[PDB]
Amino acid sequence: FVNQHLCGSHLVEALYLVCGERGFFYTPKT
Amino acid sequence: FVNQHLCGSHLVEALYLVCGERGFFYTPKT
Amino acid sequence: FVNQHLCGSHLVEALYLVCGERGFFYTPKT
Amino acid sequence: FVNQHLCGSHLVEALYLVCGERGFFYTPKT
Amino acid sequence: FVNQHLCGSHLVEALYLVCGERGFFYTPKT
Amino acid sequence: FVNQHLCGSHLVEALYLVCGERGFFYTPKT
Amino acid sequence: GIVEQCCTSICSLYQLENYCN
Amino acid sequence: GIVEQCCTSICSLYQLENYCN
Amino acid sequence: GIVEQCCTSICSLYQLENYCN
Amino acid sequence: GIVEQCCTSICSLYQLENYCN
Amino acid sequence: GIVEQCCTSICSLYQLENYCN
Amino acid sequence: GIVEQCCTSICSLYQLENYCN
């Protein structure tokens, strides 16, 4: 595939794509 | 604020806006 | 909720979320 | 340009692109 | 990765993420 | 219409809008 | 109106342009 | 759950807020 | 305006309600 | 084609990858 | 290319039509 | 975290899978 900068809503859209039904966590504080 | 009708990625976008730096968890059924 | 930087299409997506049926104006010239 | 089929937030995105710095008004029925 | 259900602009977003700097071609029927 | 900076996923969303059924190529390497 | 027309049927960019400020 | 409710029916921003960390 | 309040600076979802009709 | 398959049914990221340049 | 024309510089919706098939 | 790995730096779709449930 590729590696790119994914930030903000773009990051969570990428998480949605990759994880889908599994679900995911977005925890920027870390 | 107004009630929402959100499917797919549109829900993740809404979560992103609502939660901000707190982040969030996306946990669909099955 | 939170406070974040909302710019460009992200800003108008946030306006859509918050205003919905009410509608909204996006007038950057001010 | 081509004709468009735009629902929800997709319409607001199109307005954003079309109007640019002019901005726009989003005014749904009811 | 998980299987995808992607319509309209959501498909173009997925292509963008998948292909990165390689870019891509979007070629719908008719 | 207008002229604006269109980058990344925003660029491909604009291409989708303008080209639609015709399809398009996104070839950043050029 | 425009919001409904674009969704239930189709609309053009030229129609959209009418909603710019 | 929330993911299904927002899509099949409607949901509020206050309901969404429950899913923040 | 909205850009100065929400893009250049930082604004809440409540402040965004200022721009609803 | 891919555009229709992803929407009417499902598609994989590996299928999508075929459309990269 | 498209990035130089539309991202780095600034382009119109008409110029974007250059990249349609 | 995810921001440092994928926004500030650069990450793959595979690395993004690190954040799935």
Ligand SMILES: [Cl-]
């Ligand atoms: Cl949709």
Ligand SMILES: [Cl-]
């Ligand atoms: Cl951006």
Ligand SMILES: [Zn+2]
């Ligand atoms: Zn959509």
Ligand SMILES: [Zn+2]
């Ligand atoms: Zn963006």
